Design a protein around this ligand. Structure first.
Ligand SMILES: Nc1ncnc2c1ncn2[C@@H]1O[C@H](COP(=O)(O)OP(=O)(O)O)[C@@H](O)[C@H]1O
Ligand SMILES: Nc1ncnc2c1ncn2[C@@H]1O[C@H](COP(=O)(O)OP(=O)(O)O)[C@@H](O)[C@H]1O
Ligand SMILES: Nc1ncnc2c1ncn2[C@@H]1O[C@H](COP(=O)(O)OP(=O)(O)O)[C@@H](O)[C@H]1O
Ligand SMILES: Nc1ncnc2c1ncn2[C@@H]1O[C@H](COP(=O)(O)OP(=O)(O)O)[C@@H](O)[C@H]1O
Ligand SMILES: Nc1ncnc2c1ncn2[C@@H]1O[C@H](COP(=O)(O)OP(=O)(O)O)[C@@H](O)[C@H]1O
Lengths: 316, 134, 257, 262, 255, 123, 114
């Protein structure tokens, strides 16, 4: 059932092609999340070397062989234009959202049912973010915690004709520091403009996931399967932070999940210790627009990729 | 692995009838030139190399013993005509294959075999009535 | 036809190491199972080191010597068959000195025999008597005896003037395989606990601070009665070293009737 | 090299995957059994040049002799053949009724399974229609020539139209299975079968029961089976509709053929 | 590093082989669960035919190609001799237990940690039967739906990572009410969500209605199982799903 | 080169049916998306029935007629175009009566034209 | 609703259609059911279960209502939900589908030449 000089994927295997691409792009970028994450090289072919952890640079400047994965790269461009942060975490949640959906789709569940659960989990997750955000006044002591949290993810925990600490000796090192400063300035910009900040180290993802699980269906009975998939997708952020830091993926997530009390308690992943850690106490703070845009960006793309029924060649 | 035939060769429809029509013409060709007193002879050799020359249609069919299913029908019909009369086996053999040849293109055009049988059963009785009257 | 040179010793190491890698996880109360495919499709999920190698047919002569020695160990002693093969394989798995450094086997054998006499001397210090009325000498199991002995050689090697210090220390680190496998079967982090385990034997007493085979975390052997006999460990280390010394002395496998 | 065969773990038997429709394959084995005997149905049945196991030539149109000489190896076909052997008990006719009717039930069942209807719901409809057919058959000796097959189909189709739920799909197809028998008589007589069904339903719409197919090469019209004297037996149709439905239901209940060893 | 005439899977592929066999055996027997389930044929080769839904006959008399699956076949012979029922559902829980375990083992979890969660959930699962042999219990997967909610509301006492094994045991018991919805021709997810969502401020049972697909109180209709069947089921599935997960390597003994 | 006989009508059905199977799920407010692989490796995730068929290459002339008739619909009515191709593909997908029953198309066309006058009256 | 409403009229009107044209005449009615078949497939609800009950509502209740909700998936009256579409769009949509199908059915030889 096709014309010559073309191809068509009729059955649901077309959806598996898109799920496999996102799973692969997830495993590529998960190693460069956080400060302890590894770096990726960008060989331009002409002979220019470039090291960076910025997911926007690893998707915009790096050309991607797979056709489906190049779409998610364009979203990381759009994600960087609004907030300037969260491009890496955006791809990891998309990869896990589509991963969890395949578990239920293989059981005969339609994609449209799962996407309606994401829209419900998004609103619940978006309302819970309003409660966790801290609207304190922005002082020099606070912005330093924001700048350190943003700059640690792009430098060697230490930061022509002068050493790198004279703020560099090489060309690519100057470009790496230029990207970190622009990401650090935009992080302090968002905290100042949007006076609210949220804890980091996956403390918000762990709290929102517990809220979604403690949320009965309200739009449809089967929609909760997507809410559960949305909950497990958010937990990929603390999972990856435990991997890059060299600790067990399961022990770290279970400890922070066991922390419960009769009071506001938000714990995160300690990259040096592995134990739980109140991100607000130690001085780890993320922006409100970053986590807000993640839920809006992750749900829209994970939804649209699930609604893809066939992959046709337009004269390819 | 699990098949229905498993050696059982079978074909049905128009191709089977057309296959039998062509197989019957082979028996006609074996006795086509022997029709009449001045008909051409036929040389037949048995397993021992012994020769047999005869222009009699009945004697030719006895020595052939063709293994084709449709061909055996004409041979047993012709053999019965030899036992009952001893003459006319070639006329019966030629007419049968010729009735089959003339209705061959109509069978290919989708005409049912049963409609053809009503014509032979009808035309035969009219012919038998015309013989006795004339 | 005939195999000689470093090809022989490098082959006996891969053989004895392969036989040891099979039964690495069959040690302790969390002994992982092994699925043996019979030619007729029969399967047995046993986890006994003796019965596993008993049914596995091998071709290498060195692997047969490693198996037959454990069989002889099984008759004289009803325990320690799996530890003899793991230690004998781990002692041989350190090929950094044999090929890259071109150390003669006689140099390493002088180091292995020197360590064996010191390994035995270290066990009898950490021993503990027995009131059998309620050889009467036990030792702390759960990797405590291995890590305790390894601490003595690492300290004794500091005064070991010569090139034999390098393989002498390697035998000590080879004894860490016993708590390594016990921690792997429990599912805990091997490096994190083994690192903290070695530090306990340095500062705290060496007679305790072993490994919990059921829980996976560290625990003292005075609070947990995993005390093993002394003769089982002596014949275990003596047989593993003598077996490693045996295969290293093999430098020419030849046929002949 | 992976990915190999899916759902193949029992003696390497040919296990059809979910896309290959394992149920659709056992039905095809039964449809082929009908075509071997669909042409021999009726007074104008076509003879079969059967070759005995002794290399003997026999030209016949009897169904029991065709199957006895045709070594039927497919088990899904053996069940329908076992119904033909059970048809010989309690009656000595209606053998091809079991082959033609059951072949239509399974052939029409594929149209339901392809839509998505469960095989367990298809069985409930045929069991309901078989019970309903046994109530209508006394109201109809019964007429032959496909006369009862249209009236019994007409009476069962009305029961399915007014019966709400999913069982109406299989009940309606149970009525269309009866139409295969007039279609067999019409095809073997050299007549457009669709024209016979159109006329047989019109006269039955006007209440002219006991009307069957007029066996004639040059006349595709119909006539009254009572006036012509063509009549069938009640128990022949009763036990044939019963055993044919059980054979079809027994094949539908099966979804996978598996080998064994003692 | 290997000898001639020898082969061994040192990595975790031994579990992927054994887990794949259980999933294959799960998909075979799940179609003959309950009255609405389909039947299986048993061709002896000589021409004899035998139809039966009894899982023990489909495992004792039939022949299986996979060596690993033949182990589970012998288990059904043991399950039949003690209780006389539950051989089919025993194989489904083993496949779904191993399925959920593979999901966590791929995340780097050790198999031995998962088996400790099963032993904790199993002991809690047995106590739930005593709360809900003259004693009988409901059917229609009502116990499985209830025990699943009970195990979720139960934290470990030996370690935290056993929480994952308890979750795998909870989702594994739901295969029975899932399969009963498939064989009856109803949606797998709609049927389970209805019976699982049905809750009240009192001890209430709930099961799958094979004819309607809606929830059903088994006591109000006359659908009852035995106590020893469900008791031996939890003890049998936990033992075999455990031992299959402890298989670290598969060695050919001269095959 | 050319086509003749029953292969033409059954071939035109598979072409028109195939074009409708593409946009079967593009109907309604919960329409599904489609992935169009550009020649340069790009993707367009549109869900518009007119835009999908506009970018797809078709070899059968029957498909060009189905697409060209849909474009004429857009000029007159910017809505319901997806329903035309689906119904035209489903009306043609019933090939049982067309070929397997050996009915002439004039018999089928007379019925389709009779129903159309009845469908118009009922609406 | 308009598809199922029209299909019931043809199926009831085909009962008085003596001839071979009744079979394709009824097949056109079953083809109109594809429109709610896709609306139900997209929402994820069971197609056979709702489409079966949907046809029963048109038989008993008035045919002017009781269609399908594409968002929720359940049945709903169009008097309660403003999904009312124009007439000229449906008539031209019905003619263009039949006129197009009649066209391709009239093709029997794809010939090349200029
Ligand atoms: N010092 C820290 N301790 C714990 N978590 C951190 C720390 N710094 C950053 N993170 C986490 O790393 C994630 C990614 O941060 P960042 O690198 O700023 O964004 P991106 O990875 O998208 O560039 C954040 O969600 C934050 O929770
Ligand atoms: N209860 C326990 N806790 C921790 N470790 C144990 C326990 N029991 C045995 N072991 C360890 O298992 C190893 C093997 O013991 P054993 O089975 O007696 O010898 P073998 O395996 O040679 O038969 C010993 O070295 C011991 O340290
Ligand atoms: N002369 C006839 N005219 C019309 N129909 C006939 C005639 N003879 C038989 N039939 C039909 O053929 C069918 C099969 O008849 P018969 O050959 O006796 O049974 P079977 O085919 O099972 O051997 C019967 O149902 C009957 O209606
Ligand atoms: N009428 C019924 N309604 C609902 N569930 C049933 C019914 N009959 C059996 N079951 C379920 O099917 C399962 C398997 O039953 P059974 O076939 O007796 O055992 P096995 O499948 O092991 O042979 C039981 O757990 C029972 O809950
Ligand atoms: N909210 C709705 N609920 C149910 N059906 C709808 C709804 N909106 C549109 N439809 C159906 O979708 C079909 C296509 O509508 P529309 O998108 O306007 O035309 P087209 O698909 O040709 O662009 C219409 O026939 C209509 O019946």
């Amino acid at each position: 059932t096709l014309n010559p000089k073309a191809e068509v994927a009729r059955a649901q295997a077309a959806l598996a092609v898109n799920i496999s691409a996102a799973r692969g792009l997830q495993d590529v970028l998960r190693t460069n999340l956080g400060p302890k994450g590894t770096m990726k090289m960008l060989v331009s072919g002409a002979g220019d070397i470039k090291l960076t952890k910025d997911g926007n640079v690893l998707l915009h400047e790096m050309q991607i062989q797979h056709p489906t994965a190049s779409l998610i790269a364009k979203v990381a461009t759009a994600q960087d234009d609004i907030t300037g942060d969260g491009t890496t975490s955006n791809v990891l949640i998309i990869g896990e959202l589509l991963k969890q959906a395949d578990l239920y789709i293989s059981e005969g569940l339609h994609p449209r049912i799962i996407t309606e659960g994401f829209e419900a989990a998004k609103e619940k997750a978006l309302q819970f973010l309003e409660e966790v955000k801290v609207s304190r006044e922005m002082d020099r002591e606070t912005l330093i915690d924001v700048a350190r949290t943003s700059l640690r993810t792009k430098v060697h925990a230490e930061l022509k004709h002068k050493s790198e600490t004279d703020t560099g000796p090489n060309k690519h090192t100057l470009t790496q520091i230029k990207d970190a400063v622009r990401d650090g300035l935009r992080a302090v910009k968002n905290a100042i403009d949007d006076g609210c900040v949220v804890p980091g180290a996956g403390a918000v993802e762990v709290a929102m996931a517990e809220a979604l699980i403690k949320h009965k269906p309200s739009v449809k009975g089967r929609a909760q399967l997507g809410v559960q998939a949305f909950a497990d997708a958010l937990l990929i952020i603390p999972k990856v932070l435990a991997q890059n830091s060299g600790f067990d993926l399961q022990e770290t997530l279970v400890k922070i999940q066991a922390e419960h009390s009769e009071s506001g308690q938000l714990v995160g992943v300690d990259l040096n210790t592995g134990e739980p850690m109140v991100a607000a106490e130690v001085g780890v703070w993320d922006n409100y627009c970053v986590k807000k845009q993640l839920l809006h960006s992750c749900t829209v793309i994970a939804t649209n990729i699930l609604l893809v029924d066939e992959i046709m060649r337009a004269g390819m | 692995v699990i098949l229905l035939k498993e050696g059982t060769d079978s074909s049905q429809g128009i191709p089977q009838l057309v296959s039998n029509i062509s197989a019957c013409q082979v028996i006609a060709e074996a006795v086509r030139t022997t029709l009449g007193p001045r008909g051409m002879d036929k040389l037949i050799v048995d397993g021992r190399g012994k020769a047999t020359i005869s222009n009699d249609g009945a004697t030719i069919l006895k020595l052939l013993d063709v293994v084709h299913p449709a061909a055996k029908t004409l041979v047993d019909i012709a053999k019965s005509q030899d036992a009952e009369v001893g003459d006319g086996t070639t006329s019966v053999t030629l007419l049968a294959a010729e009735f089959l040849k003339q209705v061959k293109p109509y069978v290919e055009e989708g005409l049912h075999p049963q409609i053809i049988i009503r014509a032979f059963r009808t035309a035969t009785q009219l012919a038998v009535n015309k013989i006795k009257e004339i | 036809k005939r195999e000689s040179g470093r090809k022989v010793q490098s082959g006996n190491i891969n053989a004895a190491k392969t036989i040891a890698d099979i039964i690495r996880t069959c040690l302790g109360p969390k002994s992982m199972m092994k699925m043996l495919l019979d030619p007729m499709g029969g399967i047995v999920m046993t986890n006994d080191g003796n019965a596993i190698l008993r049914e596995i047919q091998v071709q290498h002569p060195a692997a047969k010597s490693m198996i037959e020695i454990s069989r002889t160990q099984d008759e004289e002693v009803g325990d320690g068959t799996t530890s003899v093969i793991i230690l004998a394989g781990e002692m041989l798995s350190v090929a950094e000195h044999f090929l890259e450094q071109q150390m003669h086997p006689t140099v390493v054998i002088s180091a292995y025999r020197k360590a064996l006499d010191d390994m035995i001397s270290t066990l009898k210090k950490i021993s503990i008597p027995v009131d059998i009325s309620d050889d009467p000498q036990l030792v702390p199991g759960g990797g405590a005896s291995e890590m305790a002995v390894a601490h003595a050689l690492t300290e004794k090697s500091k005064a070991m003037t010569g090139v034999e210090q390098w393989p002498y220390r390697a035998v000590a680190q080879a004894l860490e395989v016993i708590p390594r496998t016990l921690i792997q079967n429990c599912g805990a982090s091997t490096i994190r606990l083994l690192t903290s385990l070695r530090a306990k034997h340095t500062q705290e007493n060496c007679e305790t601070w072993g490994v919990n085979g059921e829980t996976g975390t560290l625990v003292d052997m005075k609070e947990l009665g995993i005390w093993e006999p002394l003769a089982v460990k002596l014949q275990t280390y003596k047989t593993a070293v003598e077996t490693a010394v045996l295969l290293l002395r093999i430098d020419d496998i030849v046929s002949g009737h | 090299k992976a990915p190999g065969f899916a759902q193949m773990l029992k003696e390497g038997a040919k296990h059809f995957s979910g896309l290959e429709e394992a149920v659709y394959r056992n039905i095809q084995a039964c449809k082929e059994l009908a075509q071997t005997t669909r042409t021999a149905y009726g007074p104008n049945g076509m003879n079969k040049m059967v070759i005995n196991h002794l290399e003997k030539l026999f030209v016949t149109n009897d169904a029991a002799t065709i199957l006895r000489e045709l070594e039927v190896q497919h088990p899904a076909a053996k069940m329908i053949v076992m119904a033909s052997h059970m048809q010989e008990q309690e009656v000595g006719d209606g053998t091809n009724f079991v082959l033609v009717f059951a072949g239509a039930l399974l052939e029409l069942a594929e149209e339901l399974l392809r839509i998505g209807l469960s095989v367990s719901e298809v069985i409930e409809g045929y069991e309901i229609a078989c019970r309903k057919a046994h109530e209508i058959l006394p109201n109809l000796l019964v007429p032959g020539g496909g006369a009862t097959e249209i009236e019994l189909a007409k009476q069962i189709t009305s029961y399915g139209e007014t019966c709400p739920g999913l069982e109406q799909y299989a009940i309606k197809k149970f009525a269309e299975a009866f139409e295969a028998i007039p279609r067999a008589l019409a095809e073997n007589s050299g007549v457009k079968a669709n024209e016979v069904i159109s006329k047989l339903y019109a006269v039955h719409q006007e209440g002219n029961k006991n009307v069957g197919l007029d066996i004639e090469a040059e006349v595709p019209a119909v006539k009254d089976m009572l006036e012509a004297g063509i009549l069938d037996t009640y128990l022949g149709k009763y036990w044939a509709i019963k055993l044919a439905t059980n054979a079809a239901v027994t094949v539908l209940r099966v979804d996978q053929i598996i080998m064994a060893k003692p």
